[PDB]
Amino acid sequence: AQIGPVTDLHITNANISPDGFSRPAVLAGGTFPGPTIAGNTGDNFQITVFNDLTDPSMLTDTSIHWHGLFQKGTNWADGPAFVTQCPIITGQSFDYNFNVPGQAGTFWYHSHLSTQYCDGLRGPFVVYDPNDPNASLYDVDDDTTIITLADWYHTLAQQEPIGAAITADATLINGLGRSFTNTTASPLSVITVQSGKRYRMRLVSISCDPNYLFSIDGHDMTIIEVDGVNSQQLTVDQIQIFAAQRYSFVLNANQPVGNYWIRAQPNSGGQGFDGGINSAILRYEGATVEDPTTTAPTTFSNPLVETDLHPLADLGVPGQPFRGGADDPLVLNLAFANGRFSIDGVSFVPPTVPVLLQILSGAQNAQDLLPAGSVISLPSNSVIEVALPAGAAGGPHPFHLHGHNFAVVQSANNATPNYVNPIWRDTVSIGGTGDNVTIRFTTNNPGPWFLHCHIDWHLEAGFAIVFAEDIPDTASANPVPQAWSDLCPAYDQAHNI
Ligand SMILES: *[C@@H]1O[C@H](CO)[C@@H](O[C@@H]2O[C@H](CO)[C@@H](O)[C@H](O)[C@H]2NC(C)=O)[C@H](O)[C@H]1NC(C)=O
Ligand SMILES: *[C@@H]1O[C@H](CO)[C@@H](O[C@@H]2O[C@H](CO)[C@@H](O)[C@H](O)[C@H]2NC(C)=O)[C@H](O)[C@H]1NC(C)=O
Ligand SMILES: [Cu+2]
Ligand SMILES: [Cu+2]
Ligand SMILES: [Cu+2]
Ligand SMILES: [Cu+2]
Ligand SMILES: [F-]
Secondary structure (H helix, E strand, O other): OOEOOEEEEEEEEEEEOOOOOOEEEEEEOOEOOOOOEEEEOOOEEEEEEEEOOOOHHHOOOEOEEEEOOOOOOOHHHOOOEOOOEOOEOOOOEEEEEEEOOOOOEEEEEEEOOOOHHHHOOEEEEEEEOOOOOOHHHOOEOOHHHEEEEEEEOOOOHHHOOOOOOOOOOEEEEOOEOOEOOOOOOOOOOEEEEOOOOEEEEEEEEOOOOOOEEEEEOOOOEEEEEEOOEEEEEEEEOEEEEOOOOEEEEEEEOOOOOOEEEEEEEEOOOOOOOHHHOOEEEEEEOOOOOOOOOOOOOOOOOOEOOHHHOOEOOOOOOOOOOOOOOOOEEEEOOEEEEOOEEEEOOEOOOOOOOOHHHHHHOOOOOHHHOOOOOOEEEEOOOOEEEEEOOOOOOOOOOEEEEOOOOEEEEEOOOOOOOOOOOOOEEOEEEOOOOOOOOEEEEEOOOOEEEEEEEOOHHHHHOOOEEEEEEOHHHHHHHOOOOHHHHHHHHHHHHHOOO
16 A cells, blocks of 8 residues: 555544544545555655645645755755745646666655644655565565654644643554543554564654654564665664654564553653653564553663764765865754754744745845845855754754754764764754764755754744855756746735735
8 A cells, every 4th residue: 555656645634533633634545644655765745735625724835845855956846845846736736757876775755844744745655676685684574564653732733822841642553542641542553563573663753842762572673774764683672762753674473472561752742651652563474463561671782872873874974074074074962942943043944935946036146045044055065063062952862964964973972973884864863952963974965955953843933044055056057847937926826926
C-alpha cells in the first residue's frame, strides 16, 4: 500500500479520532499519517497534489515539502510557501515533478504552509536502494517496518490562542495512541515481528514540536541510517529523536515470543505511561493478544549520543579543521523575545512574492530580496560553515536546512568539534545554553533554501532565514514549468492580493 513514484495525492478535510477524541484534520490520502510515498534511488517522482480542502479553520490553501530531498535543478518543487512557490488553491492541482539522484533513505513529506502540517498533512517518504550496502543486515524492510512518531493536538493549529503555552494532547505511534488527559483505552498500534528475523525499522519523527525518547522494552536497536545518510552500525537502547529526524535501526526479533512495550516519551505533554499513553506494542507472531507486561529500566544503558554516529562511507568534512575554516563562515544570532523568534535580529515573515520568483524576475542580490534581512546569499562552489549557538527559549531547537545535508561538526552538549568523521544529516538539535552546534556543507545546488527550526510553532513565530545559494545561476539551473508560473497569479487572484 505504498504509492509512487508517480501518483496522485488528494488533500482533504475529514474527522479523525486517533486517540479517541474526534476532530477535523487536513489529510493526505485520507489517513493520518498519510500514505507512504516510495520509489528507488534516482527515480522520477511525479506527485500530482490535488487540493480538495474546504474548511478554512485549517486553511484551504496548501503546499507540500519533500523533506530532505535535495531538489537539485527543481527548486520550484521544494514546497515551502513563499520561498519556492505560492500555495496551491482549493479546487486546483499541481504536479511536483522531480528526481532523487544520489539519495536513498528515509524521508517524509508535510505541508509547508503555516502550521498546517500539525493539522494532519504528514507522511513517510522512502527512497529504497536496490544495492543498499546495509541490505545484508536485515531480512524485512517494507511498509510494515516504518514507525512514525507524532504529536497530536485537540485544538486546531490556527486556533491555538495567542499567549497560551502550546502542548500536545497525545503521542501517536503509527497513527494511534492515547490522550494525556481524559485518557481512554483507545486502540494502540501493533508492530508485528517473527522470532528469529531481523527488521529495518525506519523511525520517522513527523513531530510539530516535541522530541521523543524512543525505546523498545527488552530490545536494543542498531542504527544504520541517520536522516538519509548510511551510518556505521551503532547499537543503542534508547534514541532521542528530534522533530523531522529519521533513523533506520536493525531490530533483531531475538527475545522470547511475547509482547513488549514500544515507548516514545515526549519532552513536553504527558510524562510516563499511565493508561498506556506514549506507547505502542511490539508483538511477536504466536504471542497472546494482550498488552505487554514489560517495564523500562530506570536508566538506559546505551542511549544514543550524536557524536557516536559516523558515516558508513568516507564522507569527511569539507574545509579546514578549525572554527571558521570555510570559504563562508557564518555565526547566526538566534534569539527569542516577546513571542517572536529572530535570526541576526530579523524575525521571518513570509513575503508576498516567493523568493524564487523574486530571483527569476531579476532580483540579483540578497539585499534586493524580500523579506529584507531574511535572505542571505551564499556563493557557489564554496564551503559554508554555520554556527548555531543555542540559548533562545523553547529549546532544544532542531534546525533544518533544505536542499542539502551537512556535516555536524559540533553536536549538542559537547564542546569538542569533529573535523574528521562526524555524521552528516539534515536536522540537528542545537542543544542547550552555551552550546555551539555547527554545520558544514558545500554549495553545489543553486536556489533559495530555507533554514529554520523544525518546531513548527517556532517557524511560524519567525525562526527562519533563506539561503539564496548561487543567485546568478538560479534561473538557468531551475527551469520552471508553466503550472508553477501559474501558481502565484491564481493565488493572488483568489486572495485579492
Ligand atoms: C561558536 O563558534 C563560532 C565560530 O565558528 C564563534 O565565532 C567567533 O565569535 C567571536 C565573538 O564571540 C568572534 O570574534 C569571531 O570572529 C568568531 N569566529 C571565529 C573565531 O572563527 C562563536 O563565538 C562561538 N559561539 C559560542 C557561543 O561558543
Ligand atoms: C565529544 O565529542 C568529541 C568529538 O566528536 C568526541 O571525541 C571523539 O571521541 C572518539 C571516541 O573516543 C575518538 O575516537 C575521537 O578521536 C574523538 N575526536 C575528537 C576530535 O576528540 C567525544 O567522544 C565526545 N564526548 C562524549 C562524552 O561522547
Ligand atoms: Cu520537514
Ligand atoms: Cu526540508
Ligand atoms: Cu525551535
Ligand atoms: Cu522547511
Ligand atoms: F528538506
